[PDB]
Amino acid sequence: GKPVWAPHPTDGFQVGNIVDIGPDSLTIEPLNQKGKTFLALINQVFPAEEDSKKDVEDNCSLMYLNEATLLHNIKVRYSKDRIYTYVANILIAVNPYFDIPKIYSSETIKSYQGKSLGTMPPHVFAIADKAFRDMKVLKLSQSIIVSGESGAGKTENTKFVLRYLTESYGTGQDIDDRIVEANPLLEAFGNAKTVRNNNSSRFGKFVEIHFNEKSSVVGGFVSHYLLEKSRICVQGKEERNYHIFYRLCAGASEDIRERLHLSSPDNFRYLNPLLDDHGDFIRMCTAMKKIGLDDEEKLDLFRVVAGVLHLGNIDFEECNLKNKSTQALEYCAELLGLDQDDLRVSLTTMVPLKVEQANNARDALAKTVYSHLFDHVVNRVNQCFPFETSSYFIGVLDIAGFEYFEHNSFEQFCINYCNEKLQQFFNERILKEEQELYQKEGLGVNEVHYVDNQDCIDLIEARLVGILDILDEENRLPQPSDQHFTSAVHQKHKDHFRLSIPRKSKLAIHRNIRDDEGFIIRHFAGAVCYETTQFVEKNNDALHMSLESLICESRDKFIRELFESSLSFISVGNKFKTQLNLLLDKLRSTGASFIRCIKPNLKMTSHHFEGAQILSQLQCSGMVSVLDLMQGGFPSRASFHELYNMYKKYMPDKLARLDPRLFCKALFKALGLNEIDYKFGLTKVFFRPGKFAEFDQIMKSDPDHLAELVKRVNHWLICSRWKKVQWCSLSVIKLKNKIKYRA
Amino acid sequence: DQLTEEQIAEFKEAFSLFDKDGDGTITTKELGTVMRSLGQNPTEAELQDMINEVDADGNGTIDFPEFLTMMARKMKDTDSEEEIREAFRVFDKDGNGFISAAELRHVMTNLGEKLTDEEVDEMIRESDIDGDGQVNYEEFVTMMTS
Numbered sequence: 044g045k046p047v048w049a050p051h052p053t054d055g056f057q058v059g060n061i062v063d064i065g066p067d068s069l070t071i072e073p074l075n076q077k078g079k080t081f082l083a084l085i086n087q088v089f090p091a092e093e094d095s096k097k098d099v100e101d102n103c104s105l106m107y108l109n110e111a112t113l114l115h116n117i118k119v120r121y122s123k124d125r126i127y128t129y130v131a132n133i134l135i136a137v138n139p140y141f142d143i144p145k146i147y148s149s150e151t152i153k154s155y156q157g158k159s160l161g162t163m164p165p166h167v168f169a170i171a172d173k174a175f176r177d178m179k180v181l182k183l184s185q186s187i188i189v190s191g192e193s194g195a196g197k198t199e200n201t202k203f204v205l206r207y208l209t210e211s212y213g214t215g216q217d218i219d220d221r222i223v224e225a226n227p228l229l230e231a232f233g234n235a236k237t238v239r240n241n242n243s244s245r246f247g248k249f250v251e252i253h254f255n256e257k258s259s260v261v262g263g264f265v266s267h268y269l270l271e272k273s274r275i276c277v278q279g280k281e282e283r284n285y286h287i288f289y290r291l292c293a294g295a296s297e298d299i300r301e302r303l304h305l306s307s308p309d310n311f312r313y314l315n316p317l318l319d320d321h322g323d324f325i326r327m328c329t330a331m332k333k334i335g336l337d338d339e340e341k342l343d344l345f346r347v348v349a350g351v352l353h354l355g356n357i358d359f360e361e362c363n364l365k366n367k368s369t370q371a372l373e374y375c376a377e378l379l380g381l382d383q384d385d386l387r388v389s390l391t392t393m394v395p396l397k398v399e400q401a402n403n404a405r406d407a408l409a410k411t412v413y414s415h416l417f418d419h420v421v422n423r424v425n426q427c428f429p430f431e432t433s434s435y436f437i438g439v440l441d442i443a444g445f446e447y448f449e450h451n452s453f454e455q456f457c458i459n460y461c462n463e464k465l466q467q468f469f470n471e472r473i474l475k476e477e478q479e480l481y482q483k484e485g486l487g488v489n490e491v492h493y494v495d496n497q498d499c500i501d502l503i504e505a506r507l508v509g510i511l512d513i514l515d516e517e518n519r520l521p522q523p524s525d526q527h528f529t530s531a532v533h534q535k536h537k538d539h540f541r542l543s544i545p546r547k548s549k550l551a552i553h554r555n556i557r558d559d560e561g562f563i564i565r566h567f568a569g570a571v572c573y574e575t576t577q578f579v580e581k582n583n584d585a586l587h588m589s590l591e592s593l594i595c596e597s598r599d600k601f602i603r604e605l606f607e608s609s610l611s612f613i614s615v616g617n618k619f620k621t622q623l624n625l626l627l628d629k630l631r632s633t634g635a636s637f638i639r640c641i642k643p644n645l646k647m648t649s650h651h652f653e654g655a656q657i658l659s660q661l662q663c664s665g666m667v668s669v670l671d672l673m674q675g676g677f678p679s680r681a682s683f684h685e686l687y688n689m690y691k692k693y694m695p696d697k698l699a700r701l702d703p704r705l706f707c708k709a710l711f712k713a714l715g716l717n718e719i720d721y722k723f724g725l726t727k728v729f730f731r732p733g734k735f736a737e738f739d740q741i742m743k744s745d746p747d748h749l750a751e752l753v754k755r756v757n758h759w760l761i762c763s764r765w766k767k768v769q770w771c772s773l774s775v776i777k778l779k780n781k782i783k784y785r786a
Numbered sequence: 787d788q789l790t791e792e793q794i795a796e797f798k799e800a801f802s803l804f805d806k807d808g809d810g811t812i813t814t815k816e817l818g819t820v821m822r823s824l825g826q827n828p829t830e831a832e833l834q835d836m837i838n839e840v841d842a843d844g845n846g847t848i849d850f851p852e853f854l855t856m857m858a859r860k861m862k863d864t865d866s867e868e869e870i871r872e873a874f875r876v877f878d879k880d881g882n883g884f885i886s887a888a889e890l891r892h893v894m895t896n897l898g899e900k901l902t903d904e905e906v907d908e909m910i911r912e913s914d915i916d917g918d919g920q921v922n923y924e925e926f927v928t929m930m931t932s
């Protein structure tokens with residue numbers, strides 16, 4: 044009995060031996076723990092690579108491609124600082140949590156230029172290069188989809204893609220600098236320190252580099268999605284608000300500090316080490332000057348940021364403004380160009396408002412102002428690299444993936460809806476790539492299929508009957524209620540395969556939720572229990588008419604211009620659906636590449652591979668679905684060079700003198716391998732499941748018998764060598780005659 | 787291409803001598819290298835013009851079907867045999883009507899084929915039907931269509 048991979052609660056998988064087989068489960072003996080046994084379902088036990096020390100650049104070079112061999116392979120590579128590995132064209136990127144030397148240098152960028160995947164070690168640069176080459180050669184726009192949990196490295200790898208593209212195929216002009224300075228500038232306003240990531244993206248983005256007919260850079264475009272509005276006013280312990288606040292408070296000059304009435308972050312309600320706020324303010328100002336922001340615009344942005352800070356310091360009491368909040372109202376009115384009394388009225392009027400309702404009005408005005416400023420910043424960045432026309436683009440998508448929370452609310456619902464649509468796109472594209480390969484390599488008929496999740500997408504977004512539309516209807520009711528909304532969803536989708544009631548859950552924590560207080564969605568990656576409290580409130584982006592009129596009639600042009608664009612109700616869900624639908628329209632018109640970012644542990648430490656956590660990420664990123672798809676045909680793929688180097692030692696020297704292709708041709712003829720199970724493709728040998736392992740066993744068998752098999756095909760081999768050079772001689776003469784013909 | 791399945795199969799093996807890294811594609815670089823190796827001397831203008839006919843793709847690379855198209859031209863009955871005779875003369879360096887083991891070695895190693903002097907003698911012996919220890923035109927042709 045050969046050792047196998049069996050489940051392990053913290054490692055994901057462990058090595059063991061099947062000590063007993065049953066109809067449903069296998070009895071596993073963990074390695075070197077004689078007498079210890081555990082049960083595992085037959086579908087959770089996997090074959091292992093004989094060589095536990097080997098590592099492959101492409102997981103398709105494994106004898107068994109499964110979730111356990113993949114996990115082990117990326118683990119071996121990770122311990123050697125090889126954070127990049129392929130699964131055919133998919134790139135897996137494991138966050139190292141330290142600066143690996145050489146691999147991001149300008150000299151390494153050069154070494155990747157014009158090179159096909161597989162001709163260089165796996166890298167983010169190779170994916171970026173493939174998008175350029177495919178765009179130029181196929182005359183088709185490209186997309187690079189970068190997924191993963193918070194802290195997995197999506198923002199870093201998006202940045203590596205843009206530095207690679209600009210240094211390699213950019214103009215050499217300032218537009219190159221503007222493309223690379225765009226996102227660090229947006230990071231000041233849209234990024235924040237969280238428990239999971241010190242530089243967490245609190246918004247999704249699609250970054251496009253636009254090109255003309257000659258594959259030359261003409262501009263760029265940035266689309267932003269779901270800025271986290273809650274963070275503006277309230278943040279959990281160990282968390283901060285957006286970087287800009289701390290950066291402005293830390294680095295502003297004596298002049299700016301006086302004009303904006305700024306002090307340390309400790310003096311602001313909306314505000315809460317190894318984070319260089321001072322130095323980051325310096326880099327932000329450099330980015331601002333590089334993209335073309337004048338000192339006036341810089342100050343206008345800062346005034347609004349300071350205005351929001353002072354608004355947060357306005358406290359109330361049973362209502363009226365607290366005596367200590369008089370200086371805060373004055374500082375807020377001045378910076379926002381409003382009259383002190385008009386603002387005072389608005390923060391406590393309808394007609395009178397209680398302390399809590401007053402806080403909500405203050406917080407709603409703060410959230411709306413900050414959000415409008417973030418929209419302005421994104422649009423201002425877009426104005427720094429505009430274009431009238433373009434032929435194609437290379438777009439990088441960086442958005443939060445499907446993830447775990449103890450409490451899933453409206454924000455997780457939107458993110459999980461997004462990932463349900465992106466996972467469908469990923470499935471379609473991996474299936475298309477598999478079909479192309481069976482045609483190109485002559486692997487015959489495909490007959491491979493995934494489970495579509497259109498029903499899950501429809502449950503969420505279908506017109507009239509979808510959750511998003513049922514939510515909007517609730518917002519429009521005279522007395523909106525989260526319970527009435529949840530009941531409407533349960534009534535309308537009672538028979539739905541993708542919907543469940545909390546009461547039915549195996550988990551006591553979910554069963555505690557009343558039917559009208561939550562629902563379970565069977566997402567592609569697993570069932571999620573949503574608590575629907577605050578759904579109706581979170582679905583409204585609209586600011587109350589009193590507050591809106593106030594800020595619209597502002598003395599400052601810049602503040603008026605933030606609202607120049609603009610029952611008070613704006614659907615967050617349906618705004619996102621529209622944005623997501625335009626994003627998919629763009630993605631569907633492109634050739635797509637996928638990067639799967641993996642967070643190795645929850646402690647931001649280097650060299651700490653948490654097997655179960657990583658295995659869970661590979662499950663939630665759609666990778667196991669991808670491996671099932673590949674298992675349906677020829678999951679083992681080894682080039683003639685790879686097999687020649689692996690197996691030449693087991694053969695006579697006469698065969699070792701042949702080129703890899705002829706060495707492989709001779710081996711297949713000598714072994715008499717069947718063309719059903721083994722396919723001799725264009726540049727590689729394709730093996731059906733278990734066939735590469737069979738072949739490896741035959742190669743490692745009796746040396747004298749192998750030599751006899753080779754002797755038996757001697758005549759055929761001599762004739763093959765002769766014909767190769769004779770037909771090559773005819774090629775050269777035919778090619779010489781074609782040159783003569785054309786003259 | 788509109789060639790016999792067997793001719794395509796033989797030319798597919800010949801194409802692997804151009805595609806050393808294999809890879810699946812070749813450029814003017816590999817065309818010229820191999821052509822020089824077999825007594826031909828095209829210019830970079832000639833190679834670039836020839837590749838233009840079979841590359842609508844524009845990336846400066848060609849695959850096996852594109853290579854087949856590049857070799858194709860309007861031909862006469864006589865033209866085909868003249869080519870095989872010319873191919874044999876590539877091997878028969880001194881033009882004495884026989885390919886010697888020494889002549890075969892020159893061709894083999896010019897093409898980067900690795901093999902001992904014993905193995906060259908072995909190839910000669912296998913192609914040598916009449917047993918005179920060398921390969922004539924009839925024997926070269928019989929081997930070419932084996």
Ligand SMILES: Nc1ncnc2c1ncn2[C@@H]1O[C@H](COP(=O)(O)OP(=O)(O)O)[C@@H](O)[C@H]1O
Pocket residue numbers: 138139140141142143191192193194195196197198199200240242243244640
């Ligand atoms: N390849 C990498 N090399 C070095 N540090 C990295 C790399 N990828 C991620 N990091 C580190 O991990 C942090 C979190 O990564 P980030 O790109 O912000 O994750 P995400 O956008 O997925 O939330 C970074 O701020 C950086 O410190």
Ligand SMILES: [Ca+2]
Pocket residue numbers: 877878879880881882883884885886889
């Ligand atoms: Ca001679």
Ligand SMILES: [Ca+2]
Pocket residue numbers: 914915916917918919920921922925
């Ligand atoms: Ca003879």
Ligand SMILES: [Mg+2]
Pocket residue numbers: 197198242243244
């Ligand atoms: Mg991020």
